[PDB]
Amino acid sequence: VSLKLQKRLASSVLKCGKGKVWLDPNEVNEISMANSRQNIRKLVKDGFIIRKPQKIHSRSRARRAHEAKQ
Amino acid sequence: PSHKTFRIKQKLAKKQRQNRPIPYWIRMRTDNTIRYNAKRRHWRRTKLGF
Amino acid sequence: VKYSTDPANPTKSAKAMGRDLRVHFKNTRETAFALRKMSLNKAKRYLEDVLAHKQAIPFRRYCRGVGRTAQVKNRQPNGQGRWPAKSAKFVLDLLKNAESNAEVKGLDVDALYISHIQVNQAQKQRRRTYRAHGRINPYMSNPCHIELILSEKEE
Amino acid sequence: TKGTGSFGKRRNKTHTLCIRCGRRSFHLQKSTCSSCGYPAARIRKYNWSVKAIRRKTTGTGRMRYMRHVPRRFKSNFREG
Amino acid sequence: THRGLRKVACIGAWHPARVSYTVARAGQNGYHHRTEMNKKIYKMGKSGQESHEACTEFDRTEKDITPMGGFPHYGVVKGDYLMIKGCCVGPKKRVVTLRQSLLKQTSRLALEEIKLKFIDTSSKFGHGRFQTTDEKQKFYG
Amino acid sequence: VQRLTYRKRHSYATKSNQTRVVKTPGGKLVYQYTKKRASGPKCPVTGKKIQGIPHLRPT
RNA sequence: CGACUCUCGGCAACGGAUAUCUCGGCUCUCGCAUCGAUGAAGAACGUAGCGAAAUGCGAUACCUGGUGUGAAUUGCAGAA
RNA sequence: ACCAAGUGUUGGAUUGUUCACCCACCAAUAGGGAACGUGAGCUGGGUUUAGACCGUCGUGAGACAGGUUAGUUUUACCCU
RNA sequence: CUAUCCAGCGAAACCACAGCCAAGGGAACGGGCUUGGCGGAAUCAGCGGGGAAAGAAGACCCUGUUGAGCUUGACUCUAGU
RNA sequence: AGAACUGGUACGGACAAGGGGAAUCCGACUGUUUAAUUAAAACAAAGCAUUGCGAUGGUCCUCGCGGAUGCUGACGCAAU
RNA sequence: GGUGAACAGCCUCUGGCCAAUGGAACAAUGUAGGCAAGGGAAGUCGGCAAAACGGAUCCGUAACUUCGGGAAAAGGAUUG
RNA sequence: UAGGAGGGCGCGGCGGCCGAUGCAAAACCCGGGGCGCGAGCCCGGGCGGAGCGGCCGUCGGUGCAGAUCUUGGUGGUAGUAGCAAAUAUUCAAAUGAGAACUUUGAAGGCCGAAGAGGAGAAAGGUUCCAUGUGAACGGCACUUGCACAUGGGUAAGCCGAUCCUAAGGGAAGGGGUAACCCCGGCAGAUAGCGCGAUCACGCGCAUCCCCGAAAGGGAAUCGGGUUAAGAUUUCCCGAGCC
RNA sequence: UCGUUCGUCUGACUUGGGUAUAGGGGCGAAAGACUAAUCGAACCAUCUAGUAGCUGGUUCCCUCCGAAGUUUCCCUCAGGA
RNA sequence: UACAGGCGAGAGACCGAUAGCGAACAAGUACCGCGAGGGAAAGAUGAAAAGGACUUUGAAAAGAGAGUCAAAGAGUGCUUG
Ligand SMILES: [Mg+2]
Ligand SMILES: [Mg+2]
Ligand SMILES: [Mg+2]
Ligand SMILES: [Mg+2]
Ligand SMILES: [Mg+2]
Ligand SMILES: [Mg+2]
Ligand SMILES: [Mg+2]
Ligand SMILES: [Mg+2]
Ligand SMILES: [Mg+2]
Ligand SMILES: [Mg+2]
Ligand SMILES: [Mg+2]
Ligand SMILES: [Mg+2]
Ligand SMILES: [Mg+2]
Ligand SMILES: [Mg+2]
Ligand SMILES: [Mg+2]
Ligand SMILES: [Mg+2]
Ligand SMILES: [Mg+2]
Ligand SMILES: [Mg+2]
Ligand SMILES: [Mg+2]
Ligand SMILES: [Mg+2]
Ligand SMILES: [Mg+2]
Ligand SMILES: [Mg+2]
Ligand SMILES: [Mg+2]
Ligand SMILES: [Mg+2]
Ligand SMILES: [Mg+2]
Ligand SMILES: [Mg+2]
Ligand SMILES: [Mg+2]
Ligand SMILES: [Mg+2]
Ligand SMILES: [Mg+2]
Ligand SMILES: [Mg+2]
Ligand SMILES: [Mg+2]
Ligand SMILES: [Mg+2]
Ligand SMILES: [Mg+2]
Ligand SMILES: [Mg+2]
Ligand SMILES: [Mg+2]
Ligand SMILES: [Mg+2]
Ligand SMILES: [Mg+2]
Ligand SMILES: [Mg+2]
Ligand SMILES: [Mg+2]
Ligand SMILES: [Mg+2]
Ligand SMILES: [Mg+2]
Ligand SMILES: [Mg+2]
Ligand SMILES: [Mg+2]
Ligand SMILES: [Mg+2]
Ligand SMILES: [Mg+2]
Ligand SMILES: [Mg+2]
Ligand SMILES: [Mg+2]
Ligand SMILES: [Mg+2]
Ligand SMILES: [Mg+2]
Ligand SMILES: [Mg+2]
Ligand SMILES: [Mg+2]
Ligand SMILES: [Mg+2]
Ligand SMILES: [Mg+2]
Ligand SMILES: [Mg+2]
Ligand SMILES: [Mg+2]
Ligand SMILES: [Mg+2]
Ligand SMILES: [Mg+2]
Ligand SMILES: [Mg+2]
Ligand SMILES: [Mg+2]
Ligand SMILES: [Mg+2]
Ligand SMILES: [Mg+2]
Ligand SMILES: [Mg+2]
Ligand SMILES: [Mg+2]
Ligand SMILES: [Mg+2]
């Protein structure tokens, strides 16, 4: 079942990207059943739609490089 | 344009209505020859030229 | 509504039709020419086995360019055949519909067989393809009418 | 180049809708309609195209007032 | 050259207005039948006696004709065998027909007696460096 | 780093379209549209500035 | 025997010629003289319970009013 | 000179050149035909459009079997 | 990566009929004619000898009591001065 | 900037990133050009020279009235 | 963000995508990319195409000259 | 052969004559039977379902194999050429009649910020959003879609147009013109008169009109929320400004 | 049009919008280039069914008769008397 | 006396859907061009929709039976074909 309308309206609610929206695949039924920004937000507080954590870009190697340049 | 003059808005309003399938009850009407709307217009094919 | 050939016995034969089927006429013809005069059950086995890409439909009339296979040596020695899946899947539907017709009439669906199978051309459908130097050419399909009659075999 | 590369730059409108004739023939830079001759006092019409004349002669429109003139001639312009 | 390099440019003169049979064309190569004559016999290995092994009268490392790790694509030779100077038609494992000559062998090159000094045994699979796995084992420990 | 967009439809970067980046109580950067730089008034005789008059856009 | 090709007939297709039509055209003839600043011709936009075109009409909008005829409209519903 | 066409008849300098003429090898560096074999096989050096320059000619536009430079080389899937 | 095979989709140029050769004669270079050689179903993928292959009512040349651009000491005129 | 040590003398280790020289012809250079076969030695250029013109004037447009150079005037406009 | 002179190339973060019909096989001829022993332009009209040089620091830098250049001449060394 | 003439065959009308036809006309099909040297004709059978033929006179848009003829259809070529740039997809599960192409998750990758990101100008004009889908279309496929169908959506004193001028354009009087049309400084009681006063009048009138920029000049707005689709500053909340 | 390799890159530079010049006219750092895939004279309609000594085609049967490439003249030689 | 326009009439040895006006039909329409302008195709069920109820196979379009009709093999681009 299509959840394009819930990847959108979830990026718009969480204020993040479609690639960071995460819809818990075990209960796609209720996600589909909620067809509004209000009903997306109750799902956000209910824990079925979360922001995936931002992918890590560590500058530990940049710090150690500059520390080996001083 | 998002900045369209009112003339163009008024005259694009009409070409909205000008684009609909014929009412179904036209076809059953007696001594009729209308088989479909032979004046439909699609936005990617026929440009209104204005 | 009447078929090109009348059944050997009308009351004890089922019949099925389809018009303007969107499948290749040549491929379906080559299918039918392999399915003529087969038993119904063996025809279902064979044709589903064709769609399963395990036995091949010989190509004889419309054959020029068709590559060779070993899967069709038993019946066309030079082994020129293909596995037209869309054609086969469309013909299966009519074989099943005529099996159903024969069931409703009350015949021995175990003893039915392909008494008459005919594919024939239909009204082509038009599409356009765009070539070099601003030229267009037609890009048209060859839909076919498929017409078949199962009869009960007799001693 | 000429051709495909150069047909991409059709972006600005030389002609827009005339108000006298509703054709897309109003040359803006020149401020004259290229079919009805607007804003000339008289309508641009030429005898080198009777085909162009018949497309806009009398009788191709409503004739909101002249359609009733024959009926008013009959009975000779009577009002009670 | 437009349209490819590796080909024959002219496949014949205008007349005859045909492709001559002797023009070079593209087609099957190899797996042809060939007789290749006048191959000399150096040694017969008859299984079961001192003449079988790859020990000459000079070298005495007690080794068999098969190289280290067996003949590539063929395996280990246990049965009788011949050893012919020069190459042999076909790949490994191919059946070959040995036929007596049709000519009358009278030239010197036919009449030399062949006496070997050393039969290379280092594995033909890669750069073989030892003659016997036994010597390789003693070299590594 | 949260790229920006114009808040108007004046898509070209002319003189009248001076933009100032601000960070809002929402934690989000935006543009503000500023006034252009004004000369202020000058004395015709010497060409020097007139003191005591702020350099403002005339209106 | 069989496949392929050529071919004949029967039947089936594709295609819309012919045959019979025709609220249309063309041609000839006759009668009359009637656009517009009291805003014409043309154009645009609107307008129906269910309408997009064409036909009609103009915020009184597929019509208002008088007269004439005299029981309908009509594809559906409805008030009548 | 005879029987003799089985076999072979080369690498290079300069020229677009066939031809030519040198260097060297060679047993030998013979001649030829095949739509002056061979451009849906190549190349495009020459020639042979349009640009341009010099010279002679013509009053001029222009010409040159005079010289120089730049100048698109399309298609096979049919039959054999 | 294609080309090859497979599923699906699926055109066009072109086409008098068609397609094996030699010699002869012939509109002087034939797939058809004459005399010979031969000639055994049906397909697969290449190739570029041929079909004086396709593309184009030859631009080279000539004919035309056809033009056109340009020139001038051509013929007849003309704005302007 | 300098040094000691170290490595299978490898070190702008990938990426990025001039081949050099001796000359001749042509055009001084920079620039522009036949969109879809010619980017050049062609065109332009500054430099040089020449010619007309002092306003009732020179070159030029315009069917006519009138107009461009000229918001100008010889260290300028105009034509080569 | 890193390297780097650098809005070069190469790689990653936010944001966006895996959309260009897929399955099997690895034959010839292709299109694009490479590598080659000895020689090093003999090829060809022609060094066409490719290879080679390429950053930086230090040194050195010819003829000719309009004395401004030539010049990043050429020729060497170093680089982790 | 080029050519000429005679006699006939055939198509469609008109004036006449003789007829046929729902017990089957016209047309068309046939391995049916014949007549004529031949153009052509007569009969038989089938489909067909309403008209038609013969003879005399006479009339004509009257006979096709070509014209690289015109319109329409159909072939062989041919299931052939082909579908190949932009690195790349893989696995479970869900939906579904049907999944390499839909959706969720997971993994591998690419764009690499002068982007394959976020927004605009011109241009398009409803493509935006939701729900549904028989066909057609998306050069394979599809439950899917920028497709088809029914609905919905664009909120401004502050963002722009509107206002002012630029290059320039149109013009009132006049000059030209056969007339459309062409000239704007040519100076004309000039288009406009203005301002203080109306409890009215006085003074001034100078290079004298309109149009022309969503990139020039420019009265004023910021923050936070909110929708399936509007808004950053258009709606709501607060606080301001002209 | 695509790929690599190239030219220039503070300038006689690259470019959007507004605006001016329209066909024997415009505009041209000059190639007869450009003026809407058209330029050694755009495109649209009309005069127009332009003219042609030239190419191509020119529609049913039978019967009968049945030739010429020669004279003369012509801006006449592919033609006509 | 004139009269391819308009309004209203009448007739025809005319055309019979590739014919006749370009247009028998939502024809100067759809569509093309920036613009001047260019510009088609498209008629026939049956007497009457009586336009195919229903059963069954199919996911569905449809098929097979059935039914309406004088005939549906006249079954919504449907007279013959
Ligand atoms: Mg194109
Ligand atoms: Mg431009
Ligand atoms: Mg313009
Ligand atoms: Mg080449
Ligand atoms: Mg080995
Ligand atoms: Mg700036
Ligand atoms: Mg050839
Ligand atoms: Mg050349
Ligand atoms: Mg030349
Ligand atoms: Mg001279
Ligand atoms: Mg010459
Ligand atoms: Mg010459
Ligand atoms: Mg296939
Ligand atoms: Mg021959
Ligand atoms: Mg021939
Ligand atoms: Mg013979
Ligand atoms: Mg192939
Ligand atoms: Mg073949
Ligand atoms: Mg080939
Ligand atoms: Mg050939
Ligand atoms: Mg010719
Ligand atoms: Mg003559
Ligand atoms: Mg002339
Ligand atoms: Mg003279
Ligand atoms: Mg130069
Ligand atoms: Mg060029
Ligand atoms: Mg070039
Ligand atoms: Mg003057
Ligand atoms: Mg650094
Ligand atoms: Mg970078
Ligand atoms: Mg090498
Ligand atoms: Mg060389
Ligand atoms: Mg050489
Ligand atoms: Mg050589
Ligand atoms: Mg040479
Ligand atoms: Mg090179
Ligand atoms: Mg030097
Ligand atoms: Mg005729
Ligand atoms: Mg005919
Ligand atoms: Mg014909
Ligand atoms: Mg003929
Ligand atoms: Mg293929
Ligand atoms: Mg390709
Ligand atoms: Mg930037
Ligand atoms: Mg973007
Ligand atoms: Mg959408
Ligand atoms: Mg598709
Ligand atoms: Mg204004
Ligand atoms: Mg503005
Ligand atoms: Mg502004
Ligand atoms: Mg508020
Ligand atoms: Mg390129
Ligand atoms: Mg510009
Ligand atoms: Mg410009
Ligand atoms: Mg052009
Ligand atoms: Mg004529
Ligand atoms: Mg003509
Ligand atoms: Mg002749
Ligand atoms: Mg004569
Ligand atoms: Mg007639
Ligand atoms: Mg017609
Ligand atoms: Mg009927
Ligand atoms: Mg009837
Ligand atoms: Mg029919």
PDB file of C-alpha atoms (C1' of nucleotides) and ligand atoms in Angstrom, chain L residues 49-50, chain N residues 46-47 79, ligand 63:
ATOM      1  C1'   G L  49     -34.007  -6.503 -49.009  1.00  0.00           C
ATOM      2  C1'   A L  50     -35.966  -2.166 -52.775  1.00  0.00           C
TER       3        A L  50
ATOM      4  C1'   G N  46     -33.810  -0.951 -36.999  1.00  0.00           C
ATOM      5  C1'   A N  47     -40.340  -0.306 -38.792  1.00  0.00           C
ATOM      6  C1'   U N  79     -28.087  -0.533 -44.870  1.00  0.00           C
TER       7        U N  79
HETATM    8 MG    MG O  63     -33.723  -0.762 -45.405  1.00  0.00          MG
END
